[PDB]
């Protein structure tokens, strides 16, 4: 259903993209989104879907807009208009205060520190799966891995996982029982007590670091701490889940790319950077703070613009043959983690997660494919993803280390 075309929007700029139901979805999420990049389609379009909003369609414009929070504000980052966290809806300068804090817990010293727990976590997941000949990757690995990391970071008990797995899915992907606000409220009701605890009896886990941190000149409030931790849990669980799944989906269909990484593990970090570009999966955006002209187009105050992170890398101006995966590519150009002041805090952590998953998976289960008779179902949205990934392999070809 299409919102009436507001009067300031030129007709020849109209391209009715539904970011929640794009046309050729059974062809794959990224191809469906690549429709914004046919030679005929302009830099900036207006879609009437989802209440009306602009879309930037080229990496060059996505970058400038992200570099420019004074015109393009994060106050309203999601499409449509109708979710706290902290610091997603904040701009500089207030946003730096919370970035500082989040970096104490997911920053690169912490990530370097955790490499070995991370690998160990990846290894036992994979080792329990190896003998079975089969798994649903997204549920059996892509979800438990990042959730298990979060439990270690926040020093939360292992018995709690099922509970958060549930609260988390109801937010990330409603199985249809619970409202999103309800799922959010219930996440908050698990965190509240722990954060009270960790304030009154501080440990050295992620929650104590956040809950006792300083913002501005003074101690964070329980409520601010709560809002941040939920982002730390949510923001790293859903992007990671869906992204690992696209990755394994690709490698499952691509024996030679598998072969390359199996015969030559050194390329895995370059492989991961290529997979980040090709299977980019996030498309959030910005609100205009004032009337402003931008690449031949007049934009009104209050207009929302989709700035699809996933597209920059897929833009043939930024990478030759964008839809080809090539682990050797001279300059892997992308904004899969975003750009500008909001560039994913979890970028360091996300990379190890991917590199470790690839490293440990391939040295154990080098040969696997999609389960016969399945066709993978995709969803599109703010975080595009994969519904389920049934995989099979012959246990006889696998190895323990």
């Amino acid at each position: 259903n299409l919102a009436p075309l507001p009067p300031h929007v030129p007709e020849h700029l109209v391209f009715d993209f539904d970011m929640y139901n794009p046309s050729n979805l059974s062809a794959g999420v990224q191809e469906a989104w690549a429709v914004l990049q046919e030679s005929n389609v302009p830099d900036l379009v207006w879609t009437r879907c989802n209440g009306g909003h602009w879309i930037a369609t080229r990496g060059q414009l996505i970058r400038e807009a992200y570099e420019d929070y004074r015109h393009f504000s994060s106050e309203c980052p999601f499409i449509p208009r109708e979710y706290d966290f902290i610091p997603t809806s904040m701009d500089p300068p207030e946003q730096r205060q919370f970035r500082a804090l989040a970096n104490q817990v997911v920053g690169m010293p912490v990530v370097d520190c955790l490499e070995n727990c991370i690998q160990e976590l990846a290894c036992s997941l994979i080792e329990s799966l190896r003998p079975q000949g089969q798994c649903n990757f997204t549920e059996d690995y892509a979800e438990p891995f990042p959730i298990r990391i979060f439990m270690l970071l926040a020093g939360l008990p292992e018995e709690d996982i099922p509970h958060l797995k549930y609260l988390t899915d109801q937010m990330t992907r409603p199985d249809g029982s619970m409202t999103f606000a309800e799922a959010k409220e219930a996440l908050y009701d698990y965190l509240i007590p722990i954060i009270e605890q960790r304030r009154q009896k501080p440990g050295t886990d992620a929650i104590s670091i956040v809950a006792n941190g300083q913002v501005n000149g003074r101690p964070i409030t329980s409520d601010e701490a709560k809002r941040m931790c939920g982002l730390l849990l949510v923001g790293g669980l859903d992007t990671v889940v869906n992204f690992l799944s696209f990755s394994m989906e690709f490698l499952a269909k691509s024996p030679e790319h598998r072969q390359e990484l199996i015969e030559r593990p050194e390329r895995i970090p370059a492989a991961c950077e290529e997979l980040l570009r090709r299977f980019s999966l996030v498309a959030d955006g910005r609100i205009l703070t004032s009337d402003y002209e931008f690449h031949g187009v007049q934009l009104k105050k209050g207009d929302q613009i989709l700035l699809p992170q996933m597209l920059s890398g897929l833009d043939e101006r930024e990478n030759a043959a964008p839809m080809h995966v090539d682990f050797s590519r001279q300059k892997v150009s992308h904004t899969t983690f975003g750009h500008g002041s909001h560039l994913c805090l979890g970028q360091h952590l996300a990379r190890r997660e991917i590199i470790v998953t690839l490293k440990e998976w391939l040295t154990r289960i080098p040969d696997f494919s999609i389960a016969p008779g399945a066709q993978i179902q995709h969803k599109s949205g703010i975080v595009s993803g994969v519904q389920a990934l049934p995989l099979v392999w012959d246990p006889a070809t696998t190895k323990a280390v």
Binding site: E67, N103, G107, H339, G340, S341, L343
Partner: protein, 106 residues
Amino acid sequence: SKVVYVSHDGTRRELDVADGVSLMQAAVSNGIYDIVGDCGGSASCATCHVYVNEAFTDKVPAANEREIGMLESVTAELKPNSRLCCQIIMTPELDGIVVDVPDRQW
């Protein structure tokens, strides 16, 4: 090519950096934590602040307008040799550059 990082406390580290890689990217990839590189290097954060050594200033390409703007927001003392090191890109000419790292980025 070689880059030396000296910490506020006197700690020295040296890296071998590939041509075209930022002093930020090298530092953040290699355990030099007093460079944070928060924004990943589009000169949007000011957490990659260093003082270039006075024997190299006149060999590093000039700060652009975006850098200078973001330089106003540094939290450690701003000096004339202050630069955001995600904007300093390794080349033949930079062999042996010394950068001093201030005592804060946040």
